[PDB]
Design an enzyme around this catalytic site. Structure first.
Site, mmCIF file in Angstrom:
data_model
loop_
_atom_site.group_PDB
_atom_site.id
_atom_site.type_symbol
_atom_site.label_atom_id
_atom_site.label_comp_id
_atom_site.label_asym_id
_atom_site.label_seq_id
_atom_site.Cartn_x
_atom_site.Cartn_y
_atom_site.Cartn_z
ATOM 1 N N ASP A 22 0.854 -1.175 0.000
ATOM 2 C CA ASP A 22 0.000 0.000 0.000
ATOM 3 C C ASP A 22 0.892 1.228 0.000
ATOM 4 O OD1 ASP A 22 -3.062 0.881 1.829
ATOM 5 O OD2 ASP A 22 -1.917 1.982 0.306
ATOM 6 N N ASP A 94 -6.797 5.849 3.178
ATOM 7 C CA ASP A 94 -5.415 5.973 3.646
ATOM 8 C C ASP A 94 -5.259 5.526 5.100
ATOM 9 O OD1 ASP A 94 -4.367 8.928 1.706
ATOM 10 O OD2 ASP A 94 -5.117 6.965 1.079
ATOM 11 N N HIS A 137 -6.871 12.691 12.374
ATOM 12 C CA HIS A 137 -7.618 12.465 11.149
ATOM 13 C C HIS A 137 -8.857 11.600 11.347
ATOM 14 C CE1 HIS A 137 -4.635 14.496 8.821
ATOM 15 N NE2 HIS A 137 -3.691 13.603 9.059
ATOM 16 N N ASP A 174 1.129 19.351 13.405
ATOM 17 C CA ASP A 174 1.315 18.407 12.317
ATOM 18 C C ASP A 174 1.082 19.113 10.978
ATOM 19 O OD1 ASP A 174 1.196 15.048 12.201
ATOM 20 O OD2 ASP A 174 0.532 16.109 10.408
ATOM 21 N N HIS A 176 -0.415 17.870 8.306
ATOM 22 C CA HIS A 176 -1.726 17.588 7.749
ATOM 23 C C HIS A 176 -2.793 18.238 8.610
ATOM 24 C CE1 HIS A 176 0.930 14.349 6.424
ATOM 25 N NE2 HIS A 176 0.141 14.185 5.378
ATOM 26 N N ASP A 267 6.114 15.538 10.916
ATOM 27 C CA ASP A 267 6.209 15.613 9.468
ATOM 28 C C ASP A 267 6.267 17.059 8.982
ATOM 29 O OD1 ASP A 267 3.653 16.106 10.324
ATOM 30 O OD2 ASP A 267 2.722 14.457 9.216
ATOM 31 N N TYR A 307 7.769 11.098 9.732
ATOM 32 C CA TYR A 307 8.013 9.863 9.001
ATOM 33 C C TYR A 307 9.429 9.715 8.464
ATOM 34 C CZ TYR A 307 3.000 9.916 9.332
ATOM 35 O OH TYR A 307 1.716 9.964 9.810
HETATM 36 N N1 LIG Z 1 1.682 9.340 0.318
HETATM 37 C C1 LIG Z 1 0.374 8.974 0.869
HETATM 38 C C2 LIG Z 1 0.005 9.685 2.185
HETATM 39 C C3 LIG Z 1 -1.507 9.701 2.392
HETATM 40 N N2 LIG Z 1 -1.833 10.646 3.469
HETATM 41 C C4 LIG Z 1 -1.771 10.008 4.808
HETATM 42 C C5 LIG Z 1 -1.912 11.076 5.889
HETATM 43 C C6 LIG Z 1 -1.083 10.719 7.082
HETATM 44 C C7 LIG Z 1 -0.931 11.892 8.004
HETATM 45 C C8 LIG Z 1 -1.009 11.412 9.413
HETATM 46 S S1 LIG Z 1 -0.259 12.691 10.373
HETATM 47 K K LIG Z 2 -2.004 20.466 11.422
HETATM 48 ZN ZN LIG Z 3 0.755 14.407 9.540
#
Ligand SMILES: NCCCNCCCCCS
Ligand SMILES: [K+]
Ligand SMILES: [Zn+2]
Ligand SMILES: [K+]
EC number: 3.5.1.48
Length: 620
Positions: A22, A94, A137, A174, A176, A267, A307
């Site tokens: 994956d 995801d 998330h 973070d 994201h 990240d 990561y």
């Molecule tokens: N390259 C694929 C990444 C998909 N996105 C996953 C989000 C994970 C963030 C958790 S902090």
């Molecule tokens: K954030």
């Molecule tokens: Zn993240």
């Protein structure tokens, strides 16, 4: 009264992995958790923290933020074989499931609440939880983006339910967007959510229009959701700090939270294959430190993403360093934010200006050393000390015969002799960190302290002085910058004088400390901060001031207090020793005469000091 700092961790949460191929989730590995603890082990920090044990989260704690229908769906995963798990994860976006993921998700949740209890029970001053899977998330009835249960959301509801909290601040640094956190408290004005994240004009995952500065909260909670969307990758330290100084910190201090919770995602750091930003790990020591004077230090850090197994460990250690009160490392090369950063900072400031009017615009192991007056004894914390030696006084008299031919007051040459060897102790010996001396008169003590400081060496000296009238400090050669708070016009660029007359004096001093004083000083990057307070009070802010400035000069600050004040000198040196800082209550709005005063200073200085800019420049 609180003392230590909790580190909650358990290697059991590294015992689940992605099984099938994956590309979406292969970045999320168990080694994320072991690398960051063994990094804490190596640098000698994990041993320095109270190790609270991990617990499972009761199903009645999980129902705080999720639905029974989705709890039961996840509850059945441990009985599935990988044909059935990769079908159950296809139902979500995801995310992958394991035989142990439900077990570890309950641990990641319970480990957060463990941390919440520890901090809120005054058992520890602050704390961090190294857990897996992440949280921000996941939503009421869906796993999403490596997350299963919203750990940080639990903590907020949990602290609300079990401790009667009215004002919780969640900071999601973070890279994201934590949409599950925003969804949870959307209509909730008691949980203030802040999230900066890689957006790229909705081009980046999770590709949500709600991640934009558009979304600010529905219903009675509008204005308590703050999204800062990064629209270009490669954000520098100056980008991250300008976001704090100009949207997050001004809102947090007039929110006055009773508990700060952090979605610590790393990240957002340089080298991460998913964030693609350029902030160095050191920035997190400052993102952490800048948030300490809120909620009287009660801060619960919870791990999310990060990561790059190399860059991850470094930023985890910089965070725990500042939690233990270790000196924050200096940040060089700071300047103005990039153009897109200034764009989104300007945009978010505008939408939120209808809720926080501080954003409106006119239409177009010894740490501290104290030297009180002689014969004065005082009760001090466990990291303080008192007073001169022969080689010190040799220069003290040398300084006398050269620059002070007519000064024979044995009180003041003890003033100067102490000042010299505390500076010798701070910069040269590297033993002690901060210092505060009570001086008799300033014209000789200030002049002596500054000139001896540059020859320590001190490449650059930031001087913060409250009181009226000029001082013996030459601010022309560029190796010294002056901040003055008094009751005066301004000419040169390397100065900044403020006069606020008032009942809102503590409210204006904060909107000017985060808006103006901190952004200049951080770009200036001094080797030493010199604080001066004349006898002419109002000290609701000095503790916060004396605490937030220690992000510079690697903490090394010396304070000259004129006229002994029992409650003042007690306030300054406890801020220097690193104790918890008393909140101000909610910060009221400052006077228009004072904010019009402030924007006249920003536009006057933002050209040399680009970190002042909170709007993108108008090209000539
Ligand atoms: N390259 C694929 C990444 C998909 N996105 C996953 C989000 C994970 C963030 C958790 S902090
Ligand atoms: K954030
Ligand atoms: Zn993240
Ligand atoms: K909210």
């Amino acid at each position: 009264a609180a003392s230590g700092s909790a580190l909650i961790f358990d290697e059991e949460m590294s015992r689940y992995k992605l099984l099938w191929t994956d590309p979406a989730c292969e970045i999320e590995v168990p080694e994320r958790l072991t690398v960051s603890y063994e990094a804490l082990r190596t640098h000698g920090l994990a041993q320095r923290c109270k190790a609270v044990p991990v617990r499972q989260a009761t199903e009645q704690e999980i129902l705080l933020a999720h639905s029974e229908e989705y709890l039961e769906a996840v509850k059945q995963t441990p009985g599935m074989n990988v044909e059935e798990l990769m079908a159950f994860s296809k139902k979500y976006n995801d995310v992958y499931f394991h035989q142990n993921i439900y077990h570890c998700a309950k641990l990641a949740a319970g480990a957060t609440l463990q941390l919440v209890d520890s901090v809120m029970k005054r058992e520890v001053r602050n704390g961090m939880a190294l857990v897996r899977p992440p949280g921000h998330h996941s939503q009421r009835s869906a796993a999403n983006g490596f997350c299963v249960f919203n750990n940080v959301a639990f903590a907020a509801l949990y602290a609300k339910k079990n401790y009667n909290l009215n004002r919780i601040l969640i900071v999601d640094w973070d890279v994201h967007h934590g949409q599950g956190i925003q969804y949870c408290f959307e209509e909730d004005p008691s949980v203030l959510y802040f999230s900066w994240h890689r957006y790229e004009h909705q081009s980046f995952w999770p590709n949500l229009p709600e991640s934009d500065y558009s979304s600010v909260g529905k219903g009675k909670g509008s204005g308590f959701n703050i999204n800062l969307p990064w629209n270009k990758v490669g954000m520098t330290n100056s980008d991250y700090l300008a976001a704090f100084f100009h949207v997050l910190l001004p809102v947090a201090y007039e929110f006055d939270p009773e508990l700060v919770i952090v979605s610590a995602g790393f990240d957002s750091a340089i080298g991460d294959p998913e964030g693609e930003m350029c902030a160095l790990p050191e920035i997190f020591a400052h993102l952490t430190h800048l948030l300490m004077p809120l909620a009287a230090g009660k801060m619960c850090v919870v791990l999310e993403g990060g990561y790059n197994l190399t860059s991850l460990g470094q930023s985890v250690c910089q965070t725990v360093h500042s939690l233990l009160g270790d000196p924050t490392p200096r940040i060089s090369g700071l300047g103005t934010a990039c153009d897109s950063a200034l764009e989104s900072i300007q945009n978010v400031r505008n939408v939120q200006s209808s809720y926080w009017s501080s954003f409106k615009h006119l239409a177009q192991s010894v740490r501290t050393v104290v030297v009180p007056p002689p014969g004065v004894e005082l009760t001090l914390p466990k990291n303080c000390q008192h007073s001169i030696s022969e080689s010190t006084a040799k220069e003290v008299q040398r300084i006398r015969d050269k620059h002070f031919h007519d000064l024979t007051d044995q009180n003041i040459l003890r003033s100067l002799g102490n000042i010299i060897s505390v500076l010798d102790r701070m910069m040269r010996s590297d033993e002690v960190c901060n210092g505060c001396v009570v001086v008799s008169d300033l014209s000789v003590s200030v002049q002596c302290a500054l000139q001896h400081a540059l020859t320590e060496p001190a490449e650059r000296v930031l001087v913060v002085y409250v009181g009226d009238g000029e001082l013996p400090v030459k601010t022309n050669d560029g190796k010294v910058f002056l901040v003055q708070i008094c009751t005066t016009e301004d000419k040169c660029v390397n100065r900044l004088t403020l006069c606020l007359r008032g009942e809102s004096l503590t409210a204006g001093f904060m909107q000017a400390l985060l808006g103006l004083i901190l952004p200049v000083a951080y770009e200036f990057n001094p080797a030493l901060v010199l604080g001066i307070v004349e006898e002419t009070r109002l000290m609701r802010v000095w503790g916060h001031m004396t605490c937030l400035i220690q992000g510079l000069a690697r903490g090394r600050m010396l304070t000259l207090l004129q006229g002994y004040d029992k409650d003042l000198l007690e306030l300054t040196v406890s801020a220097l020793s690193g104790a918890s800082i008393s909140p101000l209550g909610p910060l009221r709005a400052p006077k228009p005469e004072d904010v019009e005063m402030m924007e006249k200073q920003r536009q006057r200085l933002q050209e040399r000091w680009g970190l002042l800019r909170c709007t993108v420049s108008e090209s000539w």
